[PDB]
Amino acid sequence: PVLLKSTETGQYLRINPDGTVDGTRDRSDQHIQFQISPEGGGEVLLKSTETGQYLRINPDGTVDGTRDRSDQHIQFQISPEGGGEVLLKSTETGQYLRINPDGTVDGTRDRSDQHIQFQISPE
């Protein structure tokens, strides 16, 4: 598995069993492990290894987890930023994943937002 870490806040992305998505700085957290899997040729899915839920950015900017594999809002493009950092962009809505300092997670189209930069790391 990999971890998905907000570089600006040090928070790891977490999909909880209840379907909510938030951030935590707890490395022993049982729900921060992800599998990145191919979707067709150019996209990926971001899947919780412990729960089997895929990360979803909804059109309204909310972010949650779903096991609905037909969902069109679970596909992401990973874009390099330089310095081992990446952006995680939902292809359907053009929104970047953001972890806010308060631990909430949502989407934004603002590419200049500092809170959308991630580091992917093997755990």
Asked if 14 and 22 count as a contact pair (C-beta separation under 8 A), the reply is yes
Q: For residue 57, give every residue at least 6 positions away whose Cβ sits within 8 Å of its Cβ, in sequence order, or none.
A: 63, 73, 90, 92, 93, 95, 97, 107
3 state DSSP class of 70? coil
φ, ψ dihedrals at 22, nearest 5°: -150, -175
Q: What single DSSP character describes residue 112?
A: T
Q: What single DSSP character describes residue 115?
A: G
Asked if 15 and 53 count as a contact pair (C-beta separation under 8 A), the reply is yes
Q: Which two tokens stand for residue 14?
A: 């977490």
Q: Domain tally for the chain? A: 1
Rounded to whole angstroms, how far apart are CA atoms 56 and 82? 25
Q: Which two tokens stand for residue 42?
A: 């150019």
CATH of the domain at 111: 2.80.10.50
Backbone interruptions in the chain following residues (C to N > 2.5 Å): none
Asked if 98 and 116 count as a contact pair (C-beta separation under 8 A), the reply is yes
State the residue range of the domain holding 23: 1-123
CA-based nearest residue to 5, from 102, 122, 112: 122
Rounded to whole angstroms, how far apart are CA atoms 105 and 3? 15
